[PDB]
Amino acid sequence: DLHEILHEAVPLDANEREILELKEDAFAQRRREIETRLRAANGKLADAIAKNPAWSPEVEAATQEVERAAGDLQRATLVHVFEMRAGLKPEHRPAYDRVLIDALRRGSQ
C-alpha cells in the first residue's frame, strides 16, 4: 500500500534519504509495534477459541485489540506520509503529491 507506493514511485534523492533516515526507521519501529499487537491479539483469539469456541469476553476483547491496531496503522501511515513530504526538497513535492493523490483517488473508485 501507500507507503510502499510512494517509496517506489517517488524515490528519495541521496540527501533526502540521509536526512529522512531516522524518521523512516522510527516509522518502521511504529509499524512493527502496531503489527505485534495485532499478532498478540491473534494469539489471544487462538487461545480463547481452543478453550471455548464461542463469542466470549476474551474473543470480544481480542477483536477490539485487532480493531484498534488496524485503525492505528492507517493513522500512523498517513502521518508518516506527511512527515516525509515535509523533508523533501520543495521541487520534489509536486510528483510526490501526484503519486499520493492518485493512490487515494484509486482507493476511492
Residue 1: strand, helix, or coil? coil
* Residue located via cell numbers 507507503: 3
Element counts in the chain: helices (H) and strands (E): 5, 0
Minimum separation from the CB atom of position 44 to a copy of itself (A): 8
100/85 Cα distance (integer angstroms) = 10
Number of C-alpha atoms within 13 angstroms, CB side, residue 68? 14
Q: Could you say which of 5, 19, 20, 66 contacts a copy of itself (CB under 8 A)? A: 66
Q: Is 43 in the site for a copy of itself (CB under 8 A)?
A: yes
Q: Considering only 11-19, 24-32, 40-48, which stretch makes contact with a copy of itself by CB under 8 A?
A: 40-48
Q: Could you say which of 72, 87, 92, 99 contacts a copy of itself (CB under 8 A)? A: 72
45, interface contact from a copy of itself, Cu ion, none, CB < 5-8 Å by kind: a copy of itself
